[PDB]
Amino acid sequence: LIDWPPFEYMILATIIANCIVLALEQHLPEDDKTPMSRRLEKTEPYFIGIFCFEAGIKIVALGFIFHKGSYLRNGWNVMDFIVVLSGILATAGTLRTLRAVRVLRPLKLVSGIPSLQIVLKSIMKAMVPLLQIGLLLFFAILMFAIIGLEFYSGKLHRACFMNNSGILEGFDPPHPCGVQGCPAGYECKDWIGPNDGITQFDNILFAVLTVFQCITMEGWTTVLYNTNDALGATWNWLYFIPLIIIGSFFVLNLVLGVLSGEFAKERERVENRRAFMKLRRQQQIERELNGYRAWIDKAEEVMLAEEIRHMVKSQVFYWIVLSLVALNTACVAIVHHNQPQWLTHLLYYAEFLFLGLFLLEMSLKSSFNCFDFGVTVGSIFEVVWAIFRPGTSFGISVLRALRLLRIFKITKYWASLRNLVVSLMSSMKSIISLLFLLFLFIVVFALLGMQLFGGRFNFNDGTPSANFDTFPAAIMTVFQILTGEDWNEVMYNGIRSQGGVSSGMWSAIYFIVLTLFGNYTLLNVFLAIAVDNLANAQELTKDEQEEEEAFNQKHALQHHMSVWEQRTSQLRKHMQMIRRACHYIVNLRYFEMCILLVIAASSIALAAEDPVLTNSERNKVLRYFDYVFTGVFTFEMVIKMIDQGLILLWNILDFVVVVGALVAFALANALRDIKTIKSLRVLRVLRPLKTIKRLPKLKAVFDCVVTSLKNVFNILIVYKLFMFIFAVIAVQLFKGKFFYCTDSSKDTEKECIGNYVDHEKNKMEVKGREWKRHEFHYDNIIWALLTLFTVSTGEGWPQVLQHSVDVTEEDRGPSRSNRMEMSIFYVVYFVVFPFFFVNIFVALIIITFQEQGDKMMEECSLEKNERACIDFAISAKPLTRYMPQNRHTFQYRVWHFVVSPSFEYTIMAMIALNTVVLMMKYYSAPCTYELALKYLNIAFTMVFSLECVLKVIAFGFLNYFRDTWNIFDFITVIGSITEIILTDSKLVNTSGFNMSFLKLFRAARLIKLLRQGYTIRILLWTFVQSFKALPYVCLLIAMLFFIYAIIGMQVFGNIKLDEESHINRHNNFRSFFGSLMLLFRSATGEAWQEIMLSCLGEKGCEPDTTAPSGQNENERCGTDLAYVYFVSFIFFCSFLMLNLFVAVIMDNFEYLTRDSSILGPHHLDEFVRVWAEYDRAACGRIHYTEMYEMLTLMSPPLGLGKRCPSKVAYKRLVLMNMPVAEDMTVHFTSTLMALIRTALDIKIAKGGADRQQLDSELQKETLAIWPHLSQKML
Template sequence: LSNWLYLGNFPKFCPAGNQTQVSCLRGECSNHCYMTPQHVKQLPRWWKVKVMDLGLLLSSKFLYCLLSPPRYWTSLSNLVASLLNSVRSIASLLLLLFLFIIIFSLLGMQLFGGKFIFDDMQVRRSTFDNFPQALLSVFQILTGEDWNSVMNNGIMAYGGTSFPGVLVCIYFIILFVCGNYILLNVFLAIAVDNLADAESLTSAQKEAFEANVNEVKDPYPSDDFPGDDEEEEPEIPLSPRPRPLAELQLKEKAVPMPNASAFFIFSPTNKIRVLCHRAINATTFTNFILLFILLSSISLAAEDPIRHDSFRNQVLYYFDIVFTTIFTLEIVLKMTTYGAFLHKGSFCRNYFNILDLLVVGVSLISFGMQSSAISVVKILRVLRVLRPLRAINRAKGLKHVVQCVFVAIKTIGNIVIVTTLLQFMFACIGVQLFKGKFYSCTDLTKMTEEECKGSYIVFKEGDANHLQIQERRWLNSDFNFDNVLSAMMALFTVSTFEGWPQLLYKAIDSHNEDMGPIYNYRVGISIFFIIYIILIAFFMMNIFVGFVIVTFQEQGETEYKNCELDKNQRQCVQYALKARPLMRYIPKNPYQYKVWYLVTSSYFEYLMFALIFLNTICLAMQHYGQSDDFSYLSDQLNVVFTGLFTLEMVLKLCAFKAKGYFGDPWNVFDFLIVIGSIVDVILSEVDESEDSSRISINFFRLFRVMRLVKLLSRGEGVRTLLWTFIKSFQALPYVALLIVMLFFIYAVIGMQVFGKIANVDGAQINRNNNFQTFPQAVLLLFRCATGEAWQEIMLACQPGKLCDPESDFEPGEEYTCGTNFSIFYFISFYMLCAFLIINLFVAVIMDNFDYLTRDWSILGPHHLDEFKRIWAEYDPEAKGRIKHLDVVTLLRRIQPPLGFGKFCPHRVACKRLVAMNMPMNSDGTVTFNATLFALVRTALKIKTEGNFEKSNEELRAIIKKIWKRTSMKLLDQVIPPIGDDEVTVGKFYATFLIQDHFRKFKKRQEEYYGILPSKKNPNQNEIELQVRSV
């Protein structure tokens, strides 16, 4: 509509349409006011309609779209309500952010006001010359867009990287870290917290609605229809609650053959059909098809997008025929087995099968089409790479990630609608403000299109001696607000923070329609962009990230929804079952023991920590252009530190011997670093003495820096973080596999669609950034996934681009490469990567680091490593057994929540052991896994209530179901079966407490009566009461 209005074709109808729409809304509000007793509450809506006539900025077109639909869409209405609650919640945060910006703006004015003027005579827009400009510059740094250029200007304003210019970076780093990493991420936390309320409200309304529907549609109980019981699936009596079917099946079962005939020819008992069913469900056949899917994908990536008639493409063409034939044969066999599409369970009743049929059909059609344009449909064959998703049930982690992606896509539907409405609203405002105002002449002295004609002189590189004559051209900005679609496109790039300062300053310089820019003509218009960035980029776009994280965590909890153990309990129990004791070598030789005592002392650890720290300082002091004396001193210090670390290695080898030393992974790492450092020293001497250019020592110098990693082995907190970080990589490979598939599909499509665009130096499509080969396409997509100038690459793939000289274009078609498909291609890829797939990495890491924000008193897997280290002191040979008398002292040395702590009294510790189901062997020892399992079970209250024997049997059944490979010997150790009259540590300490209490009672009686109480003493009942209390 705005296009027609701008072109002059819609001047009369637009006001009439506006008035009609306003009248309809007024009538609706009047209806609400007169039909509702509390019609006064409807007055604000009436007022909103009256305001619509007051200005073009609040026209009824977009307000009606924004206000009307949520009222009739329950889940969307709840989401809008939660977002409004979020706005109220972030009011104080916005105030804090505003004060933060003001403080740094004033500080920036004091530091850099009037100092961004350099010899190159270029005009810097991001300056601190006045307060409004300082506000914009600080806000730009908060968004992270081109903030390093502003920092570089600040450093150069103070004389460059030398002192004191290098100190300027402190201002920008503090501003960026505190603003971007801390304040802005609070938006995400507040939004997600309010969205959880919206989801819970929607779920409650859905449950109420389903209850009402069931009450109306099914007034009779199901028990009145006994025939329905025959269709129920039998339960698997492994545990009190059934597990999800996906977790119980380790292998994909063969799909049964339908009872109907196939093609009206093959009956279910037909030998050919039975043979086809047996063939397609064989593991060999499935692996064979997956292999050819992989090979066909490789052939697609290997095609030459420029020279279609090249020898490589001809060879790949025949391979393509083979692949298509095999895939066609596969579909024929499946259709013969399951039928085509008429009956239930047929081939075309499955979405994955329809995808296979579509891809193979396109491949067959492409063979009959010789036109180069129609050959683009062959790209759809790459969809066959999605076929391995059938094996997701065999890879549980991949299934979890894929489910998270699909659920996240369905979950963010309402967010997409609300964001699109807001985007449309801001786009309409932008059209009213900036339509036709982003035009400019290449000669900035000309203000109109009529004046922008002829030639003008340009001083090349600012040199008056190098003149160049250029033609004047009247050009529009690549991103403009001439119509709603263009405005939404421009605002989307702003929401990604890519190139938004350039668009902002074009808006500030905009004058009138069809007029050129005037420098800083209306600075106040920047409020439009600031409000848009805060509302959309800071708030709504973070909602996407929040939904991915929350959905991933909810999917993780859904996995254990029907299980007796939650996620934390399962992780702790798995650790207790699979953990093995550590071996701690203690030498018997007195001299060796002295060395062992030295290297294991805390003083020795502090000494090595100090040496590593000093070595780090020496490495950090090296710089370009250093003097020969400084280099000589640095090399000598490196030799000294290498000698000291070598001495540490020799002492530890003497103390632990080879087996004990190399049994610790950190010692192995230290050994490799020392060997690499020794080789570094030797090669440095050889390189200086013989001037050998064949030996590169740069690789071995890396071992000097790797000494810093040794600091990770110091400190319990650092070890816990490192352990959790490594644990996060268990799920990351599945996320990485999804990303590889996404990059592969988009890379092959990009090669076929944009591969013919010529490489031009200075343009975005150049020899280092293009779609002409598969590796280059992947690198270009990786750059787009990070968001770096992705919009410029999209513009470089628009129609009218120069074709590669070696491509098969006709004469006169040199500038026919590129397509409008690039808009959908790049936006969809950026949305999938930046807002969905890439953030799964964040979700996986946050899911593993949740203990940092969880109550420390709740036992988690990160607490269990302490048990292994302290157990080794009582069991240095790692036999897995210690005396039962050592259990109390062991647990008092372990901090809560796993142990009792050193401040726990001995008697209280004994009482707590009474409640533990810790089996004790006949020789008076307890085992490693049984002790750890009992501690985990007690701390997390896993089957500790009710009947003791029944709880043990239920827990045994759960362990058998979840950890099917657990040996019965280990299971009997941690949970003795019914019938074994095992003596537990709890029973032993209960007897000990009773005896101790009885002795104290007898002592009190002796002190009171002066003699031992007789058997007929009337206080016998008191003894029984005391024993019972214990």
């Protein structure tokens, strides 16, 4: 059957049918079957027989034994054979090898369509460079887990329980006990664990799982608070804050940098260049053809005039039909719940009027029409459908608001947007294939989850909304886990369904793999799409706006590039191969400095303040300091106004700060309405912002941030328009439907009145009936926008999805899982905004990042990366490893046992065994086991101690310290010796201060094996080195954190701490550090919307101990300005984070795009080690014997590739200005610069006649480098 014209199509149809059958299965607990599932069970033998037939046709009629082109030698066919063979065994039992393996059946579509094979191959190829990053992740997870094992092991097993109510009860977020006891009539008692004994550091596996959950920023604050009340809140913050900073933010930065570098490198491949050239020529032909079409119409209009639809090409008509769209846009954006009765009638007539008018507009007739026709026909279908079945109206006329994007034509930003759309439309098959492949993998994971946890989530308190029972529910749960929101809560259910923490922990692997390969594969795919489609648009725009300049300069006849642009252009060309004394007093040298000190002092004073106790000694002294601060601030500016003459800028905020402070005690000391005083005193939080103008580097980074915002604003407009469209559609879907009664029995507001018995937590209670609304809803467009923003941030969106699914009708209480098709809206929203637009913003910031340090046009004008390499030649001192000089019986004899391969390998084995021992501890270990662990540490610390004292014998006491790593080893071993001495000696002990930190010195031996990792070490060092080159972006982020913390403390600092809310003893604005921790928690996005709601409205106020008054409560505190305060913080911080990451990525863009074929900075180490090894001591001289054999042993990618080009290579040495005129001259730097010129920027060999101008250019380009280069040239 070697000819299969449609055989493959029929097999594909069979696979599709099998996928559909697998999608209709429903899983029930305790061996229960739906009658539909029993019928579906009958279809399996047919599929098994068909697949057996197709396998037999390819085994014995294509080849199985002949190894060349056999059936099983293909990787994509062994999977098919495994699936068919395991399916056969399932019918032989008439379960893991029987039914749990048929979830790979959808993966047979990938092998069926080789296009999907190519797409998957590209996906995998793009993800290879991330592997090393993954290694750097695992070590980090290994590093902190061990630290968590030595401190938190077994410390989370007691909790406050005693309530004289049945040896039970306690707070819903249970309060673990510690070294201080319960605060009240509670007593410490044995506790299973925080998440039913799952979130803990008992052994290394639990610690690793907890650390992995924390680095994903999912519930890490709960872990932090569990150890805050179990061991005190003094040092726990020192473990979790770095863990998020290193494990989560740093890894994300590294992943983004590596991915962007790989995308830039791979955009210059031959096939990609050919495709882009094809697209460019298509666009150029279209551009030239469009202009000629104007001639045909203009001529045709004239002849008919001198012997038709000329009004539809005029500005007036194009503006009227665009203002009518704007009028329609506002018409649909005013619909809201409980709208006035006349407004409904007016809008009902307006929709008909607008539909008729737009039909009339169409009657008088790019793809503008191709989209307008679709919008209008959809509107007709929607209005016709609504009339036949009244009650529901999704709303599609709002899609015609997309025509408002045509207003960009009058601007100068139309070319870039049109190019972006053109590039996206050209590369649409690839995008569709990528989305389909992601859908296929999601389907496979949903089926696997249905097998593992299907029909197992109905516990005693009810089944969760995120279950794997039906296919829609399983796919929703898998999507939620992929987005990484509340995945730990699903993992907890998946563990306690397989047998609890005892024997169900193996089910965590599913969620770990899903989280990893959804967090990073999704980012890879979508960032690749965004980068490859935005760089193409940038190149098209630059080639379209530069061919008109050249043409215009020819019509008369007859380097602000970003780092990305420069690097990508260079990568391509290298691939083919009275006012008299006031002026004096303000112009003093030591004047601005004292202003900085006073501003910093005022900021620190703002930091130290109690918002609850208004009238205290500290607050009084702080106000007294504020008096002199505002006096000096008035004095700093009155001398400038009588100097610069007021207005004949940036210091407007300084003026408002100075003025508002005077009014602050003008009204306070005027003598009722004390609230205006507090509201006016929040102004002084702009005091830190006064340092931006004074510091020039801070001003530079602020200007860079502003320019980035200006660059992104154009796409921000489109993002806002799409968000508005979605919000308008979301209103028509869930307007007024987010209401519920406190008891599930009642459905409307009429019944929801009175009292009812509540049977929660196995306890009865009489509670009033309240007709409440969900906290986040879609009642109007502002609430819809806020809800969609919170969903886009990714916080609490599963709860909003559940509320939307429970939606039933206009004014009725929810019905569980009533409308499950409402999850289409959220899936589409997630695919569009957080998956595509955010990556568009990131890519646009990446590819349009202007260099900040240089800010110069012609720094070298020939290259950019070799400037460091050019200056590296004079800085490449042969730093030796300090070999012994004595060569005697004492120093040398022991030295041969240091460089010997027995010693180093033995030390590596000892390090590996020590790391194995470190993770061998667990809670409730036998006493003999702990004793063995203790004595094992003693053995290892002697070997490392002996190694430390054996190095100093050979290298030298003042010589062994010359290396950073040897200092680290000495400090580690000294700390370990101190630790073992202090806690083992019978009489040398302590009873007071706790020296428990010394355990870190024992756990800091992991970094030793970091010496083995070469590329990991280089990458880490490069990123760390480029982190300290920009110490003012971090300063800007710190300033934003400080300002927002001060604002929150001054505004939300007096809210009463209440449990069951998110402003409690753990999370509040009471102190500066508490507010800073709250802001960090919100930045990581834990429950920031819950905090925003809990600091919103008329919350009860903290009792003020001081300031006596004649009332009891006066007024409630807590503003309604919380919304802005959080919505502005989630944006700003995020932006300020992104502008940081790119600032680190573009600083190392030379490393991230290495192109290891003509590498020059990475090759310097090889030449350095060769020169060091050949001459034991440099002595400032080079012999005339080893040069002629240098190119042979030196790496092939430079100098010498083979014997055929060896003649050319040698001709690149002779017949020019040779240094061998004097045989005792320099022969290293000469051939180095010869190689550098030959490898890059060949400009002298071709000419070979003029050399003085090149020497002058080299001398003038390196004037301030201590110019001893007079002999380097020779």
